[PDB]
Design a protein around this ligand. Sequence first.
Ligand SMILES: [Zn+2]
Length: 99
Amino acid sequence: GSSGSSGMPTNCAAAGCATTYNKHINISFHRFPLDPKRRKEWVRLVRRKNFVPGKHTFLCSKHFEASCFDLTGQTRRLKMDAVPTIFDFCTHISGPSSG
Ligand SMILES: [Zn+2]
C-alpha cells in the first residue's frame, strides 16, 4: 500500500493460492470488476463453482498479466476491463478442457 492503514488478512478467492499476509508480499488486493463482462469472467476463470462476488472477494496481482493494470499513466491500478488470463489451476494433468 501507500499510506497503509486498514490492514486485514483478506484471503484470496483464487483457487490453489497461498496469499493472505506474509511479510515482504507487496501484492495488491483488487476486488472483482463491477462490469458484467469481467465480473463473470473472473468467477468463470477463478474456477470456483457458480459463486458470486459479495464480500472478501479479491485476487492477487500474480494471477494477472499486470499489463492489464493502469500503469500506462503512472501508478498501477487494475483496470476494470481486465481479467485473469492465467491461474495455473492445472485442469487435470496437461490435456485441455474438452469435457
Ligand atoms: Zn491469489
